[PDB]
């Protein structure tokens with residue numbers, strides 16, 4: 001027999017993702033690099049593996065859309081809601097949607113796609129918001145002007161509570 005897990009998590013370490021469509025704001029390559037770096041935030045501190053799919057059905061379908069885009073969470077135009085992701089599960093589970101009425105960047109201008117993606121992928125993986133104002137998973141987007149991204153210890157503890165640490169060295 002099997003009882004349901006205590007927490008929403010993926011029951012597999014090998015996850016797939018697909019970039020379904022792209023924002024006008026950035027190149028395909030900038031967008032791919034941003035999502036790849038954002039997934040690496042999480043895979044670097046767990047046993048999670050992320051494989052990009054070019055088509056078909058991935059665990060984490062990523063898309064850019066505006067207003068009503070096929071769920072109960074319509075976007076709201078410029079500013080306000082930025083993005084959202086669904087917790088682990090079938091179908092819409094794990095999917096991450098980015099509001100394409102925002103300006104997405106690879107800088108401190110607009111909203112940094114890597115930074116918001118890393119945060120959305122936290123949700124895609126089972127993390128909700130943290131009270132730690134320094135946390136990646138803090139509910140309010142701020143861009144610190146840090147040159148170097150470092151996953152805060154709060155988010156490390158959170159994600160490792162779900163998936164364990166993976167290799168504690170490289």
Ligand SMILES: COc1cccc(CNC(=O)c2nc3ccc(F)c(OCCc4ccc(C(=O)O)cc4)c3c(=O)[nH]2)c1
Pocket residue numbers: 082083106107112114115116117119120134135136137138139140141142143144145146147148149150151152
């Ligand atoms: C939709 O809601 C949200 C969406 C996102 C975040 C949040 C909440 N969390 C934050 O705002 C936040 N968490 C951090 C945690 C650790 C860090 F290191 C940080 O600085 C990294 C800077 C940096 C940015 C970009 C590059 C690049 O492009 O490589 C390199 C470095 C930050 C940070 O700046 N902000 C809410």
Ligand SMILES: [Ca+2]
Pocket residue numbers: 058059060061089090091092093094095
């Ligand atoms: Ca999914």
Ligand SMILES: [Ca+2]
Pocket residue numbers: 075076077078079080081082099101102
């Ligand atoms: Ca918006």
Ligand code: NA
Pocket residue numbers: 023024025099100101102103104
């Ligand atoms: Na946009």
Ligand SMILES: [Zn+2]
Pocket residue numbers: 069070071073074084097
């Ligand atoms: Zn959505």
Ligand SMILES: [Zn+2]
Pocket residue numbers: 119123129138139
């Ligand atoms: Zn969030």
